[PDB]
Structure 1
Amino acid sequence: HMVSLPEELNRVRLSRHKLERWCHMPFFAKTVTGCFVRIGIGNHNSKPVYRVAEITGVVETAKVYQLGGTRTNKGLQLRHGNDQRVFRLEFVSNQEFTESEFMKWKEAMFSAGMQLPTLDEINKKELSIKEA
C-alpha cells in the first residue's frame, strides 16, 4: 500500500548534514535521487517555512558556495507535487517533517494527479542507501 504517514517517509529523508557529508562522493546523485528533503522556502509572518520535496535530480550550478564545512556547486532539483525547482543544499533542513508539512505535501500531490510513493519503493531506496 501507499505511504500515508510522515514517519514512513522519514526513512528516505536526507538531512543537510548527510548531504554535506556526501556531496563529493561519486554516485552522490544516484544515492540522493529518489530521496526526500525538508526544504526551506522562506518566511511566513517572519517565521521559517518548510516543504516536503522529492529529489528528482542533481544539478551542477555555475557557482561554488559554502555548505557547512565544505564547498560545492551542486543544487537539488526538488519536486513538490507540480512545483519543481532547483535549490542550493544550504536551504535543506536537518529536522523531520511535521505532520502538517506532510499533509500539505499529500494535498499538493493529490491536486497534481500524482500517485504517492509505495512503501516498497521507499524500502527499496532505504535499503540501497543502507548498503552503500
Structure 2
Amino acid sequence: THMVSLPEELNRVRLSRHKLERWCHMPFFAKTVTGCFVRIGIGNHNSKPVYRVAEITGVVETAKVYQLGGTRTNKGLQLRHGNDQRVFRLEFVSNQEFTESEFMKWKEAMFSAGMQLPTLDEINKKELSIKEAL
C-alpha cells in the first residue's frame, strides 16, 4: 500500500480559495472540505510570503464575521501541520499549488511529529468523492 510522495498527488485534494469561497455557504461544507488540504499563507519572512501545507481537520467559528471575497463569513478552518493545529480564516488560503519544497517540508514535519502520511488511495477516493458530489 502506497503513501503520498509527490506534490502532484497531494494537489489533487488541495482546495483553492476560490472553491472555499464558492462553497462556504453550502449545507455540507464541513463534510466536503474535511480531509482536504490547503496551501496556507502563515506570514512573511523578510517581507516575503511564506506558505505551508496543512490538512483541514474541521470547520469552526471565528470571533468576528469577516470579509471573504464578496461575502461575509464567520467560518474558520481547523488546520493541521504535523502536530501544529491552528485555526485560520479562509482569506489566507492560497489559489496557487504546492511547491515541491513546501511538500518536502511538510513530509519532514510529519515524520518528526510521528504522524502517518495519507495513502494515495485515500487521496484518490477523497478527490473522487468531491468530483462526484459536484
Task: Give the TM-score of the pair, scaled to structure 2.
Answer: 0.97
**Number of corresponding residues:** 132
Q: In structure 1, how many angstroms separate the alpha carbons of the residues matched to 2:62 and 2:100?
A: 32
3-state SS in 1 of match to 2:74: strand
How far residue 48 of structure 1 moved from its aligned partner, in angstroms, is 0.2
C-alpha distance after superposition, 1:90-111 (max 9, x if no partner): 0000000010100000010000
3-state SS in 2 of match to 1:12: coil
In the other structure, the counterpart of 2:82 is 81
Provide runs of 4+ in structure 1 moved above 4 Å.
none
How far residue 61 of structure 1 moved from its aligned partner, in angstroms, is 2.1
How far residue 60 of structure 1 moved from its aligned partner, in angstroms, is 1.8
Q: In structure 2, how many angstroms separate the alpha carbons of the residues matched to 1:73 and 1:46?
A: 28
Q: In structure 2, how many angstroms separate the alpha carbons of the residues matched to 1:67 and 1:100?
A: 28
How far residue 63 of structure 1 moved from its aligned partner, in angstroms, is 1.4
- List alignment gaps of at least 5 residues for structure 2: none
C-alpha distance after superposition, 1:42-66 (max 9, x if no partner): 0011100000000000002231110
3-state SS in 2 of match to 1:94: coil
Task: Give the TM-score of the pair, scaled to structure 1.
Answer: 0.98
- List alignment gaps of at least 5 residues for structure 1: none
Q: In structure 2, how many angstroms separate the alpha carbons of the residues matched to 1:30 and 1:97?
A: 23
Q: In structure 1, how many angstroms separate the alpha carbons of the residues matched to 2:77 and 2:124?
A: 22
Aligned-residue identity in percent: 100
